[PDB]
């Protein structure tokens, strides 16, 4: 592990991947809100939470397996064994939110925002931005998914409701 690795990771990610990476690490960078991905990785390494396994898990969650192979010289099974061995840096709640967001198009996110405006008081935002807003209002949480579940059912997205139910049953 070095700083060249952090630089390569920062320069080899696109905008959506960076936005997702910032969202997944929201539970480890709570006191500080990192402005960009490089500063987030610098803070994680400063706090000792950015080892080789931690960065491998991060790249695994953003599904950048090419960077896992090229930069960290790891395959899928290696990162899976690391996740089975040690406690995770990113909780299953963040992974579930990111997965549901990845399976939602602009129209679905727009319709979902339209339903949420009853429970919460202006640009085209992604699903993760909506999750962040709901978190800022204590409307969604790992132990509080009934509202998001109902809204996903109401937009005829039963598969994501089943993802939420699977998460609820795994705990």
């Amino acid at each position: 592990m070095s700083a060249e690795v952090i630089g390569q990771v920062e320069e080899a990610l696109d905008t959506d991947e960076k936005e997702m990476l910032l969202f997944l690490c929201r539970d480890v960078a709570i006191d500080v809100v990192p402005p960009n991905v490089r500063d987030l990785l610098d803070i994680l390494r400063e706090r000792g939470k950015l080892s080789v396994g931690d960065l491998a898990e991060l790249l695994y969650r953003v599904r950048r397996f090419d960077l896992l192979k090229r930069i960290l010289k790891m395959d899928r099974k290696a990162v899976e064994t690391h996740l089975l061995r040690n406690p995770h840096l990113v909780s299953d709640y963040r992974v579930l939110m990111a997965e549901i967001g990845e399976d939602l198009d602009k129209s679905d996110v727009s319709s979902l925002i339209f339903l949420m405006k009853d429970y919460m008081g202006s640009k085209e935002k992604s699903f993760l931005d909506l999750v962040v807003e709901l978190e800022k209002l204590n409307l969604v949480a790992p132990d509080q998914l009934d509202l998001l579940e109902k809204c996903l059912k109401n937009i005829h997205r039963i598969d994501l409701k089943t993802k939420i139910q699977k998460y609820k049953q795994s705990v």
Partner: protein
Amino acid sequence: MDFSRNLYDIGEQLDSEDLASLKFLSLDYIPQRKQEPIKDALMLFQRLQEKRMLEESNLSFLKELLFRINRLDLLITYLNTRKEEMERELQTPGRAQISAYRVMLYQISEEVSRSELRSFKGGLQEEISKCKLDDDMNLLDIFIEMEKRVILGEGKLDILKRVCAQINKSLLKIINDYEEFS
């Protein structure tokens, strides 16, 4: 009821044709600049919510809209309003929020087919430029362009009668029925 979910379901049962009809029927309340970005029903609803014409206690304009586009299924299902009821409510003077001039025009669009629309476009070459008479335009867009060029209006139905008298005869009846009420 749940108002946002009800509006969302109403919008989900509306295709682009119904949306264009609603946008045309709401021209007297939503200007052109705000009408251009409306690409779904919910957006339209939001604009109405900004003018307080559609709220949890004021469904009158929404009921009138869904009645004029002949979506009685949505009226009975989501607004719990029957076909005859609206008729009564729309016969009272000043209770109707959509002008009789607007509705009339929309009804003309219900009685024109595709070839009839092509003939209607061919009938306005001397009064409207070619870029606005493209094959993509529907009859409501032609009415809007005519209003922009002040050839169609509440007191200016001469060109409308002239063009209608060459494609179909029932349209002249609709125009004269609306006219006699003035």
